[PDB]
Structure formats: structure tokens, C-alpha cells
Amino acid sequence: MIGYQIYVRSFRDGNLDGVGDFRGLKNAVSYLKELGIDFVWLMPVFSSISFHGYDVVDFYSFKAEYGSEREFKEMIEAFHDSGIKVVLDLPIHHTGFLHTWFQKALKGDPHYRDYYVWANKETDLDERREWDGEKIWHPLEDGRFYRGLFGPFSPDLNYDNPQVFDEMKRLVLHLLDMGVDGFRFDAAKHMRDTIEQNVRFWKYFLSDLKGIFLAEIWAEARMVDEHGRIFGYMLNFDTSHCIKEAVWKENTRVLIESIERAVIAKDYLPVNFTSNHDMSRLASFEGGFSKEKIKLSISILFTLPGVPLVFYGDELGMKGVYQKPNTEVVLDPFPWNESMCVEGQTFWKWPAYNGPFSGISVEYQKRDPDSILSHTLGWTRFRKENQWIDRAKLEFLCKEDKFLVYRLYDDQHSLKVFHNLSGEEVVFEGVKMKPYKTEVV
Amino acid sequence: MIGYQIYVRSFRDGNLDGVGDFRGLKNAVSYLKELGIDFVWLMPVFSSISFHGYDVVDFYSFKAEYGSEREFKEMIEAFHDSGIKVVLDLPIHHTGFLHTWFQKALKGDPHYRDYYVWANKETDLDERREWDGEKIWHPLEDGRFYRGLFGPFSPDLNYDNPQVFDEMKRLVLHLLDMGVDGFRFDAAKHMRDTIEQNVRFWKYFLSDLKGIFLAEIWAEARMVDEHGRIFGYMLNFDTSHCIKEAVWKENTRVLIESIERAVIAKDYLPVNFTSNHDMSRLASFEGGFSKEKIKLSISILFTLPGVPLVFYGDELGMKGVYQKPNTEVVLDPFPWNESMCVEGQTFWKWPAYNGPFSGISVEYQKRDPDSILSHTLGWTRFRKENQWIDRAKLEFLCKEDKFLVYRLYDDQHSLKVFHNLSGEEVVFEGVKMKPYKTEVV
Ligand SMILES: C[C@H]1O[C@H](O[C@@H]2C(CO)=C[C@H](N[C@H]3[C@H](O)[C@@H](O)[C@@H](O[C@H]4[C@H](O)[C@@H](O)[C@@H](O[C@H]5[C@H](O)[C@@H](O)[C@@H](O)O[C@@H]5CO)O[C@@H]4CO)O[C@@H]3C)[C@H](O)[C@H]2O)[C@H](O)[C@@H](O)[C@@H]1O
Ligand SMILES: C[C@H]1O[C@H](O[C@@H]2C(CO)=C[C@H](N[C@H]3[C@H](O)[C@@H](O)[C@@H](O[C@H]4[C@H](O)[C@@H](O)[C@@H](O[C@H]5[C@H](O)[C@@H](O)[C@@H](O)O[C@@H]5CO)O[C@@H]4CO)O[C@@H]3C)[C@H](O)[C@H]2O)[C@H](O)[C@@H](O)[C@@H]1O
Numbered sequence: 001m002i003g004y005q006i007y008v009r010s011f012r013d014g015n016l017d018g019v020g021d022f023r024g025l026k027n028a029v030s031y032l033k034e035l036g037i038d039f040v041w042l043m044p045v046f047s048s049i050s051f052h053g054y055d056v057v058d059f060y061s062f063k064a065e066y067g068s069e070r071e072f073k074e075m076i077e078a079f080h081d082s083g084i085k086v087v088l089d090l091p092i093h094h095t096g097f098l099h100t101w102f103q104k105a106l107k108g109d110p111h112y113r114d115y116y117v118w119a120n121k122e123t124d125l126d127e128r129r130e131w132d133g134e135k136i137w138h139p140l141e142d143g144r145f146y147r148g149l150f151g152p153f154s155p156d157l158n159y160d161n162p163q164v165f166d167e168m169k170r171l172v173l174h175l176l177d178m179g180v181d182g183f184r185f186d187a188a189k190h191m192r193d194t195i196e197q198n199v200r201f202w203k204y205f206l207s208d209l210k211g212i213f214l215a216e217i218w219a220e221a222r223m224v225d226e227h228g229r230i231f232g233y234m235l236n237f238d239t240s241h242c243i244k245e246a247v248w249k250e251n252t253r254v255l256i257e258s259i260e261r262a263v264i265a266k267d268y269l270p271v272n273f274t275s276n277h278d279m280s281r282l283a284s285f286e287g288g289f290s291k292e293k294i295k296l297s298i299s300i301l302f303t304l305p306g307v308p309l310v311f312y313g314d315e316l317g318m319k320g321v322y323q324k325p326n327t328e329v330v331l332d333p334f335p336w337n338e339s340m341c342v343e344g345q346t347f348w349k350w351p352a353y354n355g356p357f358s359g360i361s362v363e364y365q366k367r368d369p370d371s372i373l374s375h376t377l378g379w380t381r382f383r384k385e386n387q388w389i390d391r392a393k394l395e396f397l398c399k400e401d402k403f404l405v406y407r408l409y410d411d412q413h414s415l416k417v418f419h420n421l422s423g424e425e426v427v428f429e430g431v432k433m434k435p436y437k438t439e440v441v
Numbered sequence: 442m443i444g445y446q447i448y449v450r451s452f453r454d455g456n457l458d459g460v461g462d463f464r465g466l467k468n469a470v471s472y473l474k475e476l477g478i479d480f481v482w483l484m485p486v487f488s489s490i491s492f493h494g495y496d497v498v499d500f501y502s503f504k505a506e507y508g509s510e511r512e513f514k515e516m517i518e519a520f521h522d523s524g525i526k527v528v529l530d531l532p533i534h535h536t537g538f539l540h541t542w543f544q545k546a547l548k549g550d551p552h553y554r555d556y557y558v559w560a561n562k563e564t565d566l567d568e569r570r571e572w573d574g575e576k577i578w579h580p581l582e583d584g585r586f587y588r589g590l591f592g593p594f595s596p597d598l599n600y601d602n603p604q605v606f607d608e609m610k611r612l613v614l615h616l617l618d619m620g621v622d623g624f625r626f627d628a629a630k631h632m633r634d635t636i637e638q639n640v641r642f643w644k645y646f647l648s649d650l651k652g653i654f655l656a657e658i659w660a661e662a663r664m665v666d667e668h669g670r671i672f673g674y675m676l677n678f679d680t681s682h683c684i685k686e687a688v689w690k691e692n693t694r695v696l697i698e699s700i701e702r703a704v705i706a707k708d709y710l711p712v713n714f715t716s717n718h719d720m721s722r723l724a725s726f727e728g729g730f731s732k733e734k735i736k737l738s739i740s741i742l743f744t745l746p747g748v749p750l751v752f753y754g755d756e757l758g759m760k761g762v763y764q765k766p767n768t769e770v771v772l773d774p775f776p777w778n779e780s781m782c783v784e785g786q787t788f789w790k791w792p793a794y795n796g797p798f799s800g801i802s803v804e805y806q807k808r809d810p811d812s813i814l815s816h817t818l819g820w821t822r823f824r825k826e827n828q829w830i831d832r833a834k835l836e837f838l839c840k841e842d843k844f845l846v847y848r849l850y851d852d853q854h855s856l857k858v859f860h861n862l863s864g865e866e867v868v869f870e871g872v873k874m875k876p877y878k879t880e881v882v
């Protein structure tokens with residue numbers, strides 16, 4: 001199993017307007033299939049006014065710019081015809097400020113008023129986030145305060161209200177009933193105010209539901225476990241980082257610690273990725289790094305158990321440094337050819353980090369056997385033929401400073417991995433591990 | 442007559458995807474009618490993969506994101522419904538690289554190969570643009586060289602060929618029966634190789650047509666004059682830039698030589714604009730300027746013969762420093778309210794020079810008489826009750842380095858206007874004029 005994270009608007013255009021849409025997604029299948037992609041994780045396809053669409057104004061209507069509900073379905077159909085699943089990012093933790101539910105709660109409506117979170121005499125208004133620490137309590141003139149973790153325009157939904165519960169669960173059944181193979185529950189970590197409350201929440205919420213359930217609980221390995229089992233697919237921020245950090249600091253330690261810590265034997269499938277939209281792209285890790293180091297990070301990712309996910313463009317090494325509040329710098333148009341002028345190319349805005357003629361397009365890299373894509377095409381094909389590695393067991397045979405070597409095995413398999421993090425050859429079991437290379441014996 | 446240039450994607454959203462479209466444009470009518478707009482010029486609405494949309498790939502289909510032909514026309518009616526005309530930007534000078542005809546011409550199709558311009562053995566392959574001075578002749582793997590004054594992906598059509606003419610003649614007709622009121626001809630200055638050939642062309646092209654034919658010719662007034670009579674409406678870059686520079690230098694000199702140069706006695710209407718997408722915005726003119734000098738620029742614009750045009754947002758003070766290749770920095774989303782979060786608002790990308798809570802939104806300035814909007818309103822409202830001023834005659838009653846005074850008159854009408862370009866008070870014939878104020882009597 002190999003995933004691929006797509007930002008719809010930047011992937012492929014299907015109606016000749018430069019804006020990525022459902023039809024173009026549909027025509028990109030060959031690329032995905034040639035990339036050995038099993039399922040696509042599609043960032044917010046629901047109508048919101050933002051560019052990233054995490055503040056949904058309606059879950060029952062799609063983004064006009066991506067397409068119609070009919071077009072959405074023919075893309076689902078098509079993807080299946082080609083054996084690929086489709087997982088939709090679902091930010092049900094909060095609705096946009098303009099969602100009709102919030103618009104009503106605001107205008108006094110009682111039924112919807114309970115759909116959201118408001119300040120109570122016994123509530124701390126100076127309460128801030130655990131990370132950036134900006135307040136979560138936002139004021140209305142009528143002295144009213146509704147809580148919103150991710151800002152005043154992403155009002156948190158009351159998941160205490162058993163009405164919201166069904167209100168939403170009915171939706172999950174809707175998209176599923178429509179074809180959606182799975183969801184990527186956006187912010188799964190914050191559905192309720194206490195760790196214990198959230199676990200049970202998901203317990204009930206996913207009760208009688210089948211399909212890929214990917215959760216985003218950006219936290220300490222320890223917590224991800226508790227939910228772990230319940231979803232079946234947990235986003236492994238731990239290792240996703242540690243691979244790059246280890247390759248960067250040319251040291252196996254943290255990777256070894258994180259492998260044992262966040263991968264080894266889990267009641268669920270840790271989803272390990274190259275990078276995502278909330279951080280700098282693989283190719284820009286810590287002031288960006290070596291073309292050969294980028295590959296090594298991709299090799300390690302595909303030679304470790306769990307489910308390997310690639311954020312669209314990472315297989316080409318697209319550049320991008322995370323920034324605020326213009327987070328669209330890491331959502332550049334996917335470069336199909338060098339001129340970025342081809343039936344299908346997106347160009348809704350001029351590229352921030354990845355412009356035309358950069359030598360990083362699909363049509364450019366496809367040729368040079370030394371390219372990051374040609375390389376990734378290598379491990380994606382390998383991992384396609386070795387789906388037994390998903391649950392495979394790991395056994396370290398070498399924990400040196402600049403190199404790692406372990407063994408992946410199951411009842412009827414056993415493969416030995418050789419990762420050299422230094423840029424100077426080292427030997428193990430007769431094997432001559434080259435600089436910054438993964439060998440597979 | 443007052444104009445309004447709208448970049449559709451950044452104006453109003455009618456399908457809740459936070460992207461401008463024909464439906465929101467329709468919903469933006471109250472705004473426009475109340476702003477005193479007689480006709481809106483709409484930047485390229487045809488299918489193209491760029492964000493601006495000047496490299497068309499078909500003129501018979503609308504930019505997916507903006508909507509369908511259905512919605513396009515439901516909008517056309519509503520605008521006509523409110524006494525507003527729809528002028529369309531028409532990039533018929535060239536086609537996009539992906540446009541059908543050029544793709545067929547790339548194969549050799551006898552018919553379409555001659556729809557474009559090819560280099561000859563006696564053609565200076567290293568020709569150059571008059572201004573920035575770049576290559577006009579683009580190469581092709583098989584030695585070929587085609588001509589595209591705007592880029593290898595914007596290959597100009599060959600107008601020595603009647604088929605190209607007919608082809609575009611039908612188009613205009615098509616869009617006209619469609620209800621469109623007129624066209625803003627993009628690069629209307631380079632339709633032919635000889636300044637004589639160009640006029641002949643335009644003369645013959647528009648010979649039996651009716652509507653607002655606004656030409657775009659970026660040249661000395663003398664050239665604009667030769668084509669003048671044929672279109673009837675000419676975009677006036679000469680005076681448009683002078684009203685801005687004269688304000689910036691508090692030196693009426695250039696303005697007078699300019700008003701004399703391109704506005705006085707013309708056999709067609711000079712269209713005077715606040716600014717456009719090919720240069721910085723009014724508010725950012727030459728390091729941008731004070732809320733004072735901005736109103737003064739507008740004051741002057743709405744008190745001169747010809748047709749005053751406002752590039753969307755300029756009535757608000759929208760900053761925007763022009764630059765390339767990311768020319769979308771001047772196309773910031775038109776801010777309806779401060780939080781930029783209200784049904785109809787766009788946010789397809791994070792603003793470049795006009796982020797949220799910047800005090801320039803429409804809802805914010807509607808509640809302040811001193812705001813650039815209130816000031817523009819008075820000017821459009823005034824010029825609305827003085828239709829005679831477009832065809833009006835001018836003569837200078839007073840010419841002083843820092844303040845201008847002149848007379849607008851026709852047979853039954855006469856008006857005195859007083860402009861103060863300096864920050865120091867000035868009085869003329871028993872009438873003081875505060876710093877940067879304008880007075881009409
Ligand atoms: C309104 C917003 O909507 C969208 O914003 C989105 C939303 C809201 O719909 C949710 C998701 N992302 C959230 C996540 O669901 C949440 O739990 C937390 O995640 C924080 C995390 O809670 C914190 O603990 C720390 O996590 C720590 C770990 O705990 C630690 O163990 C070790 O691994 O280090 C990391 C980081 O140092 O930092 C993370 C990010 O900085 O914030 C991120 C941004 C999306 O990916 C994101 O695009 C847009 O993306 C935004 O731009 C927009 O502003
Ligand atoms: C393919 C392209 O499409 C789009 O570009 C678009 C196209 C392509 O269809 C045409 C139009 N604009 C063209 C214009 O139609 C053309 O004639 C020339 O216009 C030149 C002019 O010909 C030249 O003489 C000089 O003008 C002189 C006057 O003659 C002189 O009297 C005094 O006023 O000083 C000025 C400047 O010093 O500079 C002007 C601009 O720099 O270039 C501008 C950019 C549009 O506004 C523009 O958005 C995008 O904007 C681009 O980013 C993209 O690359």
C-alpha cells in the first residue's frame with residue numbers, strides 16, 4: 001500500500017483553466033498507477049472560500065472550481081476502474097465561519113446554537129493554544145464568545161451534542177455511500193477536551209463503519225496508540241520527521257529510537273510520509289538539502305513498515321518552505337513538463353518555489369535515469385511487489401553511528417535493509433553499502 | 442460614462458469556492474450601480490491555463506472557474522437589467538500555445554499552419570521588443586522559429602491571412618449576439634506590422650459593427666490619435682500616468698502638457714484610468730502615496746473630459762506593487778469586509794499587499810465619509826449628473842506650478858475646476874484650496 005497526498009487545485013486541470021479539478025485528477029491516473037499509488041488522500045474537496053478549504057461552509061456541496069458532484073463521482077468510478085482508492089480529508093472538527101449552522105447560531109437560532117462552543121461564567125477567556133498559544137476564545141459584540149481552536153473563522157463544533165454526532169456521522173455514510181473509500185479526519189486529536197473523551201468519541205463515531213480511516217493526531221507517540229487501533233491508519237509524524245532529521249544530522253540514533261518507538265508492533269498501521277502542507281517540503285528540510293539526501297529519505301520511508309505516503313510533488317523533489325499566513329507556498333502547481341505549458345498543467349498562481357524550466361518536471365525527470373522521480377519510481381515499484389512489509393516485523397542487525405541495517409520478515413518472508421547515512425562507504429555482511437544508499441538483500 | 446475594470450477571480454464569489462465567477466459578478470451589481478458604474482470591462486474570461494488569461498486556448502468557451510455559458514449569460518442579462526454594459530477583454534492578437542490552431546500548426550496542417558507567423562531565411566531571428574527588448578522569434582526543435590511578441594506560449598496570429606480575420610470577425614459577432622456590449626482589445630497596437638497596416642485593419646475589422654470598442658495601444662498620443670476615430674474609445678495611458686506623476690511631484694507641468702496633448706479636441710473618447718494590472722496600483726504609484734494624493738488623483742480623473750475608469754479596488758486604496766513573473770501581486774482579492782470572510786468574498790490565495798483587517802474593505806469605508814471610497818463615490822455620483830463632461834471642452838483659467846484651474850464647458854454647460862497639487866494652502870480669485878483639495882464651481 002502506497003498513498004499519495006494531493007492538493008486538488010495544484011495537481012491536474014481537466015477543463016482548460018489552469019485550476020486543478022476532478023476531471024484532471026481523473027486523467028492523472030496513469031501517472032499515479034505508474035507511481036504505484038494505492039490510494040490518494042485528497043485535501044478538502046468541500047466548498048469553503050479559502051484556498052486550502054479546511055474551513056468548510058458546506059459538506060454537501062463540492063468546490064465549484066474542482067467540479068460538480070457528478071464530476072466528483074465519475075472521478076471516483078474511474079479511479080476504481082484503475083484500482084485506486086480515494087480518501088477525502090474530513091475537517092469535521094469545526095465548520096467555517098459562514099457555515100449555515102454557524103450563521104444561524106449567531107442569529108439567535110437555538111437548535112443550531114448548541115452545535116457550537118460558547119463561553120460559560122466558569123470558563124477561562126485567556127485560554128490559548130498549546131503550541132503557538134494564541135487565544136481560542138473569540139468575541140462577538142453581544143458579549144458572546146464561541147470557542148474556535150483554529151481561529152475565529154473556524155468555530156469549533158460541539159461534539160458533546162449528540163445531534164452534531166449524528167449530523168456528521170450521517171455525512172460520513174453519505175460520502176462513503178457515494179464511493180469514498182476512506183477519510184482523513186482532519187484534527188482528529190481535538191474532537192473532545194480530554195484525551196479519554198476523544199478515544200471513546202472515535203470509538204462510537206467509527207462503530208459500524210468500514211474503510212480507510214486515517215487520523216491526524218500530531219502528538220507524542222504514546223497518544224497516537226490509544227486512538228491507533230480505532231482508526232487502523234495513524235499519521236506517523238514521529239518517524240516522518242525522524243527519517244529526515246536522521247538523514248540531515250547524518251545520525252541513526254533518533255531514527256532508531258523513533259522506529260522502535262513509533263513503528264514496531266502496533267494495533268494499527270502507522271502512515272509514514274515524505275512531508276505535508278503544514279510544513280516545508282521534503283526537498284527543503286532544514287534549509288533544504290542534497291539531491292542524494294532527498295532520495296535516501298525516500299528509500300528509508302519505503303523500506304520501513306507502515307504505510308508510505310508521498311505528498312504530491314515530493315517524488316520530484318519540489319521545493320517549498322513553510323510560511324504564514326501564505327501557506328500556499330508549499331502548494332505550488334505540479335510541474336508536468338519544463339515549460340509548465342501542457343494540456344493538464346495547473347497554473348492558478350505563479351510558482352513560489354518551483355517555477356518553469358527548473359529541471360524538476362515529470363516529463364524532464366522521467367527521462368534522466370538519475371532523477372528523483374526515476375529513483376522514487378524505483379522504490380514505489382519495489383514496495384508494490386512487497387506489500388508484506390506493511391505489517392512485516394523489524395530486527396536491527398546494525399546500530400552504528402553513520403549506518404543502519406535491520407531485517408524485515410514475516411511468516412513467509414525476510415528482507416535485509418542497508419541504509420548508509422554518511423557520504424563514505426561502509427561494509428556489512430560482505431555488502432558494500434554506498435554513500436547515502438539503501439540496498440535490499 | 443464611468444468604467445470599472447474587473448479581474449473576475451478577485452472580485453466577487455457566487456459559488457462559495459472563494460473564487461470569483463460570473464455568478465458573484467452578477468451579485469456584485471448593487472455595488473457597481475451604487476458606485477456609479479456605467480460599464481465594466483472584464484479581464485479575459487475565455488479558457489486559458491494562466492491566472493490572468495491572456496493566452497487563450499479557445500474563445501468559444503469560458504474559464505471553467507468563472508462558470509459556464511449559462512451563468513455567463515444569466516449575468517449578462519442582470520448587468521443589462523441595471524443599466525450596465527459588459528465590455529469583454531478580447532485577447533485576439535494571439536492564441537495560447539495550447540490553443541487548437543497552433544497545436545495543429547505545430548504538426549503542419551496546411552490550413553492552420555498559416556494562422557501563425559513563421560520566420561524566414563531573410564528574417565532577423567534576433568529581433569527585439571521595443572520596450573523590455575526581448576526575443577520575438579521563438580525556436581522549435583526542428584529548426585523552426587515562430588513569432589510571439591508576448592512569449593513562446595502566446596504565438597501571435599497572422600493577420601495577412603483573411604481566414605484569421607474571418608475567424609475573429611465571427612467571434613466578435615458571436616459574443617455580440619451573446620449580448621456583450623463591447624470589447625477591450627488587448628495588444629490592439631500590434632495587429633499589423635506597419636502603423637498604417639494596423640489602422641487599415643482595425644478600420645476594416647470594425648467597419649460594420651456596433652458597440653463599445655475600447656482599444657489598448659500603449660504609445661505616444663500621436664499614435665492613439667490615428668486609430669482614435671475607428672474605435673471611438675481609446676485607453677489613455679498618456680494622461681492616465683500624468684495625473685499620477687503630476688500629483689507625486691506637486692508639479693502641474695506634465696499634467697497640463699498631457700491634458701493638452703491627449704484630451705483636448707479628439708474625435709473619439711480618451712479613457713482615463715486610475716491604473717491597471719500591467720503596472721502598480723494607484724495607491725502604490727512610485728513608492729505609493731498618501732491617502733491625500735490618492736483622492737487628488739481621483740479628483741483630477743473625474744474632472745477631465747473623456748471616460749474615467751477605475752481598476753477594481755482603486756476606489757478602496759488597494760496597494761499593489763507591480764512586478765514579474767508573479768504579476769498576480771496587483772490582483773489581490775477585492776476586500777468586501779475587514780476579516781475577508783463574508784458570502785461573496787474571494788480568497789483564492791493569501792493577499793500580496795492587502796491582507797485582512799487593513800482598514801481598506803468596502804464594509805469598513807461605507808461607514809466613514811473620509812474614506813477613499815466615500816470620496817470616489819462623490820466623484821462618480823457628481824460626474825453622473827454631468828454626462829456632458831466626457832465630450833466637454835477645456836481651457837485653462839489658471840496655471841501655477843502647484844495648483845491648476847480650468848474650465849469645462851459645452852454649449853449649455855460650464856464649470857470651473859480648482860486642483861491643489863501641493864500640501865500648502867493656496868487661494869485663487871477669492872477661493873482658498875486646502876492642501877491637495879479639488880473644487881468645482
Ligand atoms: C485555519 C487554518 O486552517 C488550515 O489548518 C489545518 C487544520 C484545521 O482544519 C488542521 C490540520 N493541522 C493541525 C492539527 O490538526 C492540530 O492538531 C495542530 O498540530 C500542531 C500540534 O497540535 C502541536 O502539538 C505541534 O506538534 C508537535 C508534536 O506535539 C510534538 O510531539 C513534535 O512532533 O513536534 C510537533 C511540532 O513541533 O505543532 C503542530 C503544528 O505546528 O495544528 C495543525 C496545524 C491541517 O493539517 C491544517 O491544514 C490551514 O492549514 C492553516 O494555515 C489555517 O490557518
Ligand atoms: C504573456 C503576458 O501576458 C500578459 O500581458 C498582457 C497582454 C498580452 O495579451 C497585453 C497587455 N499589455 C501589453 C500591451 O498590449 C503591449 O502593446 C505592450 O505595451 C508596452 C508598450 O508597447 C511599449 O511601447 C511601452 O510603453 C511606453 C509608451 O509607448 C510611452 O509613450 C510611455 O507611456 O512609456 C511607456 C512605458 O515606458 O511599454 C508597454 C509596457 O511596458 O506591452 C504590454 C505589457 C495586457 O495589459 C497584459 O496584461 C501578462 O501581463 C504578462 O505577465 C505575460 O507574460
Ligand SMILES: [Ca+2]
Nearest residue numbers: 017019021505
Ligand atoms: Ca479547472
Ligand SMILES: [Ca+2]
Nearest residue numbers: 456460461462
Ligand atoms: Ca467561484
